[PDB]
Ligand binder design. Sequence first.
Ligand code: HG
Ligand code: HG
Ligand code: HG
Ligand code: HG
Ligand code: HG
Ligand code: HG
Ligand code: HG
Ligand code: HG
Ligand code: HG
Ligand code: HG
Lengths: 58, 57, 57, 57, 57, 58, 58, 56, 56, 58
Amino acid sequence: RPDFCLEPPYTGPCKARIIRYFYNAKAGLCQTFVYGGCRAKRNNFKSAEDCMRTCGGA
Amino acid sequence: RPDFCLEPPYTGPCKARIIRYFYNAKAGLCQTFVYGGCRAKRNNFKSAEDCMRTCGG
Amino acid sequence: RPDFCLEPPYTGPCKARIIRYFYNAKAGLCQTFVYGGCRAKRNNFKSAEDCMRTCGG
Amino acid sequence: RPDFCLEPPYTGPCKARIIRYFYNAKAGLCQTFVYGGCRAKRNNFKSAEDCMRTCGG
Amino acid sequence: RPDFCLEPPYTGPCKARIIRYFYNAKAGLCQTFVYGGCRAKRNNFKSAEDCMRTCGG
Amino acid sequence: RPDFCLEPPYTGPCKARIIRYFYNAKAGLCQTFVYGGCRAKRNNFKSAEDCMRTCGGA
Amino acid sequence: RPDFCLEPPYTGPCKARIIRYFYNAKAGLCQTFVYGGCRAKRNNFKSAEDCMRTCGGA
Amino acid sequence: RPDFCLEPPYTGPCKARIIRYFYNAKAGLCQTFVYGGCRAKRNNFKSAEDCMRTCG
Amino acid sequence: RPDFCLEPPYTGPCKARIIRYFYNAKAGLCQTFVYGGCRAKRNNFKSAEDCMRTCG
Amino acid sequence: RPDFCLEPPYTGPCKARIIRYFYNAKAGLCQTFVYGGCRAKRNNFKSAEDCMRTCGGA
Ligand SMILES: [Hg+2]
Ligand SMILES: [Hg+2]
Ligand SMILES: [Hg+2]
Ligand SMILES: [Hg+2]
Ligand SMILES: [Hg+2]
Ligand SMILES: [Hg+2]
Ligand SMILES: [Hg+2]
Ligand SMILES: [Hg+2]
Ligand SMILES: [Hg+2]
Ligand SMILES: [Hg+2]
């Protein structure tokens, strides 16, 4: 998996309350977090399918 | 039916207000609850189809 | 993990070609398959989040 | 539970292949079927939430 | 028509502000209301198609 | 309601098999039909909410 | 086009913050507005395709 | 109005049958067409909001 | 690239909190911003496909 | 960017006709392809936002 999959989730400075997915390398799966709407980092997926595929395997 | 289906719904600490589904054992069907956006337990489904099949029967 | 997470994915006899998710116990991850639209088995999820969470651990 | 919940699912004459939900009384939950796109009967829900609440209990 | 189609719409005690559909028996049509996310009554539809079809006739 | 709400549903010449809604003035509600993807007439709604509101009352 | 296409957008008294489309007759196209979730008037569409087709032309 | 807004809708060579939106310069509005799933030209919108705003 | 692609994202005066896409000319790609629900400028896409194709 | 962003799009052996996004490294952006529903490779995204963020830059 890409190293960015090891990043902690990043809400960002904006004020929306949007459900996004991040890879939790300890749990070995993707989990939800609240994304603020701007300045996303790469461990942030709109689709849980994309999170699993991008980050699931190494 | 998995045992996690018997747990009460868990909103969690986060501040989003997102519709999710949980199995209500007492009622014998899936129902809606408000999910906060993080730290979900297993009695938590984005899709009602998934909730029924996983926790029903 | 629910035992149904260990079932091979099941398309069924119907003629739709719908993306669904199943847990691959060998690979230890959810993957897509083509669902026919009827007679689903339990290792079949509309949502990928539901697949990962229900069939993880 | 409305009586229409006890009818078998009805695909109809049209040629689309669309996932819908119907209540399976024998099984005591909603299930998927393929809907053709026209001439629907009432045991036909776009949303699984709607199916459970309308036909469950 | 199911009798539950005659219930006034019910927001419930939860704090989400989600669009749902209800049948207005007086007007003879489905209309929107704001659903709070928990303790739904049956005159509550995620899909407008489901509302019209379930509560029509 | 607009007169176009009295039109019979129109699939059109294209080959997609898309669910759309039309107002059935006899039934007094909107029903599904299969839309082909092109050359829509006005009694054709992507959302069933829009069909009810646009065509429901006179 | 139906005369309801000439009305200003109507949020209504309810407290949701939902994106809907209204036809802007001066602009000749549909635009977004915030709908409150109840007491809709007819110049209010869930889908932009529906808005533009219904209030399309003359 | 971007010049690509005046181009005819392009289905392309692929075999999917998916509703997309295109701006019809003559009609003065966005309409539906069938998109094959690959090699999209720019007069091709998944969202009708985007079509009207971009091309209208 | 249409010139509107070079404009900064515009939230507007309305009170909704909705994810939209804008083309960031500097970064050379589309990114998310919060849109208030009214008075959208053209560098505003509901679909990221439309943003990349239109502005990329 | 992850090296999987360099692979050509992969339809796979299954028979569905689903729209997915792949990163076109030469073009510098994501484009649509038809996915068959199984045996996905990693340059395959349900959401265009995810594709562009994951395979974004270098
Ligand atoms: Hg996967
Ligand atoms: Hg089921
Ligand atoms: Hg999870
Ligand atoms: Hg329910
Ligand atoms: Hg109907
Ligand atoms: Hg209505
Ligand atoms: Hg149109
Ligand atoms: Hg617009
Ligand atoms: Hg593109
Ligand atoms: Hg991005």
